[PDB]
Design a protein around this ligand. Sequence first.
Ligand SMILES: c1ccc2[nH]ncc2c1
Ligand SMILES: [Cl-]
Ligand SMILES: [Cl-]
Ligand SMILES: [Cl-]
Length: 163
Amino acid sequence: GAMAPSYRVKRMDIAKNDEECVVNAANPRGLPGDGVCKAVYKKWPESFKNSATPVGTAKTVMCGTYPVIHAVGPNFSNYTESEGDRELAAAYREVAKEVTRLGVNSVAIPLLSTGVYSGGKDRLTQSLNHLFTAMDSTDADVVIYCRDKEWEKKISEAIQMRT
Ligand SMILES: c1ccc2[nH]ncc2c1
Ligand SMILES: [Cl-]
Ligand SMILES: [Cl-]
Ligand SMILES: [Cl-]
């Protein structure tokens, strides 16, 4: 575990992370995809061997010795708000299990279902609160990666609020 487990946020490409493992915002079919998923495919293509897994689950594949945790959030274009919320919570619980199993002291994580799976809605708060519910009982240093300058401020504020 980390000596004083923390949450941090960085605005940069998760493919350049400084953590002991990475969470991919995966599709269920283990396809290269776009956004976070395509950057992850370009950096760790070996991790996409038999990475396909259902919605609400996480599947780890090693790229050398570096773990890639493929976490499949719901596409809110297809799910109801209620069912989507349940699957988004579940995907993060499966990430917490994998992070624990791997024995890593740090993890880079994107906000699941906030991009092309968002169904055109702002899900920063919904996705971040499910991230916290899952990861609060783990002792890994968590570093959340985002792209948008206003999202960085709001994630930083949410972390600071609970400290
Ligand atoms: C992908 C490419 C460039 C980027 N700059 N900040 C976040 C990010 C993600
Ligand atoms: Cl970058
Ligand atoms: Cl997404
Ligand atoms: Cl973002």
